[model samples]
Target: QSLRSSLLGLRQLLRELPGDEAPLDALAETVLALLAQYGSLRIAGLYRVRYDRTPEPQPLATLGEMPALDADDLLVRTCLERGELVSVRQELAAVCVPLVDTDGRILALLAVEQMPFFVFNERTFSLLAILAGHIADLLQSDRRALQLADIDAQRFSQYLKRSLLDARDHGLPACLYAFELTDARYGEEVQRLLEGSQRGLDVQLRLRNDEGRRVLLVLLPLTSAEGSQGYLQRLRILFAERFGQARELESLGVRIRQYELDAGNDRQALGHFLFNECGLNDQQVA
Candidate 1:
């Protein structure tokens, strides 16, 4: 019965694991989502273990704030010793789940940071292990390179921090496009329109629901408010063709808003956007 549960859970996670085009951020997001829905893990990260040569843990994506990982990190080394999916500790309380192949060779490791308050069991570790296994299989079997971006609430705060820091360092011309959806049925169209319009290096868009309202927030790096006119125009045209004009836009309960960023100069304003548009920073430890 427990084995069946593990298989079923793996099936469910595989279903939600977006295709190769989805990005590595989704792996961290998927792991974080499981942690949020079950355990009270504060931080969780997915790392790619180099298997062709000397094995090493390279971060793929992470949710919440995980302490910096070292090449000789105990947790990494512990998982390295064996290929089985299990939990280990070096100094702090962390779980290392292996991504093993069908032949039972481990490929990657999904490290779940401390739970802060709850005890973890095999089932929890197994779920993360299976997730990493499938992702590794997907990549190896298809030889597709994995990309990454943040999508969950727990990772949203981390996303903001990296974005703010990136802006400070690069001062790229960027803008935020926020859209609220009333009927989530049209969400697929929204995702296609936004994601399809971006360059390869552009940061991924984040979609989340606050209460019942679905919101899509996109940060267009190296794009200024004025520079974003073409994108805005494309958005209007698509909405008009699909839904209708501005009046009918809200008729469908759709609201689109934009905020201009002064690159690195207006960092506080970006934080202000997070404060209002998200419940970020307000989520307390349980």
Candidate 2:
């Protein structure tokens, strides 16, 4: 009776709810409340991610006991990699669900910490997965409408330096890219395009230039040099679709600079490269 009621009630309630333009917090609260009332959902949490904050998943809301998570958390990582709900240990959480966009970029995450053992079965799992899908669908428009975030030149330099150190000490692979545009008019358009094109973890920064050139920087964390080629190809395709041809970037006199950071790379030389070659000033780095 409980199983049947849970399924039926969830479906019925979900159907009655209109797709209103309510903010994410209210919407998430509504859904969480429904699940907790009619179903076995006892403890849960929701996390939102913006690219500016790396590794850490920002806690949007929490019901009962819920632990913090980062990109590297075992459950979160598995959910992100699979783009689905993943079941971990009962002590940690019943499951972790990723709210991913069409491009497989994660928008948010739902972690269920406690549920009745009797109700935690395939049926309940299916319901949680459906909830995740519905939430993602509801947030699709909001995610697209979000304003692109710009990190200041100084802060961006700090993150770049830390990432370089992380690569050296932790043996991580990363790439720093600089895209220079001869025309300043296309700065906003290019920035928006890059914001959408990059992964949820990658960081983008626009450097202030008095030389009349618009320079945009992108840092690809956990990305190898060979893997960056795919992103470059995608960028070309995006430019082609946006303008007229893949060569449009070249036609517009856009220049690209790339630096790869891996284990044992000279950190001092990398700093020099950022300062001298990438136009980072001593004040910005310091």
Candidate 3:
């Protein structure tokens, strides 16, 4: 049954695979289906290690009724630290499959949890290991493409910032507003707001960074002081209403700072003003 199920899953995966495929949603779904067939999988998830911080892992996707587990959890930490597969059989038996790229650097970890009877044996472990390897190959390719996309995005942002700076340098009414996610808990909410803003504002919105911290910087060109203030007001109200109490903002330490360029200030100074004086770091702006 397991072999037949694996074959069926492989077929589904191949059918869904792209010619220039970066394994993403399709691959995740394929693995989920295979796990469902072979084991009593109650929860399954995948996490990718941060390139900058090799020790840190970021949750990529999940399936089933699993509560949001920290990336620092025992399973993830063990697999990443050891650079190998690790299994735990405490309250529930679970398998942590490490996905390493050609360099043998652990890129991500796939976790599966279920009842005791579904405990992984050597054969099952080997199969999962192979699957994870394939998945990692696809993911590494995807990561490269994503990195390039990010570079393109940063270049565009620099262009927009320069244009705004130029307008402000000429004594025009230009203001800057950068939004950052202070609380990791509100990551999803912020993402939703960003998505909504893309449609509403019809402006170019790029993910500045999600490195050690998560932040999104939006550059609005040709915005007047009054217009920026009004937008901030509406944003605060909308965030509060949509995300329950305004307490989340306070808890997350979410903040926004506005600046108007002085007549003598040049575009470079304006850049520093938005980033340095306003506490927006390169990671946040990039």
Candidate 4:
């Protein structure tokens, strides 16, 4: 009955993590609470893998003494490489579970320590692994949504401008500049350029994958009342300069193209035209 109750609690905790509902603190508390019912555990902690740089795992959250371990630490490296649940028994006893993503990437680590020897069982480790995956999924989904939200906001703002003014009212031509970097290696450079431009211009840029080509779509709001030519010229110059400076772009091929929206076309119609005519389709950046 006790084991069943604990399992039920774990399920409930996992369910809470989907969508935007679960926060970091809530996950930590739920794990700690469920573990406490089973044994006299002193500390429960969560660690996330930093894959890009030193390849070290860092603690995301903890309820007890957090150990100081370097990137080369045996235990940390072992957990990441194996992508399995590990338990080290010595002066400091702890169990480490790898949080893996759909792409088989090790997203984070969950550690439960300072417990009795008998407490670290197969069932315990299994439960922790399941919960760790839930946390990983939640974090990834939240980040993706945030990125898309920023894109959507820019789209809406541009739509508003077109709606308020007549097509002929704007003296300049209406054009949508969708800049794409075809090189996969320059993904980071493209992402940085998009982020930097957001602060400067009211533009929407989204990383997309169409067919097999990865690209960044920048939806520009151009109106006849506004001088869009100057804007496009300035944007092209900026894009070229930044793309050239990226270290990765030197190795991978980068290509960019621009499209002009049809005169007096509605935002939705123009969007469809860009997608259909410009060959912009579903793409994602790594």
Q: Write the per-residue lDDT of candidate 4 for residues 3-93, one digit (tens) a residue.
A: 3344345545555665445544456566555445444556766654666412344555566676654446566567777776677854453
TM-score of each: 0.38, 0.45, 0.38, 0.38
- Of the candidates numbered 2 and 3, which has the greater lDDT value? 2
**Local distance difference test, per candidate?**
0.53, 0.63, 0.55, 0.52
lDDT of 2 by residue, 59-166 (tens): 677788767663376766677677777886554356776665434456677777777888877666665654455345435544333434333443354446545544
The best-first sequence of candidates by lDDT reads 2, 3, 1, 4
Tell me, by lDDT, which candidate is best.
2
lDDT of 3 by residue, 126-208 (tens): 65655555345434444344454564464345435443533543333455555655667877667577557542221444344
RMSD of 2: 13.2
Model 1 misplaced regions, further than 4 Å? 1-166, 183-199, 245-248, 263-267, 278-286
- Point out where model 3 deviates above 4 Å: 1-22, 35-40, 52-59, 89-93, 115-118, 142-286
| Model 4: residue 9 alpha-carbon error in angstroms | 9.0
Candidate 4: stretches off by over 4 Å: 1-40, 53-58, 89-93, 143-286
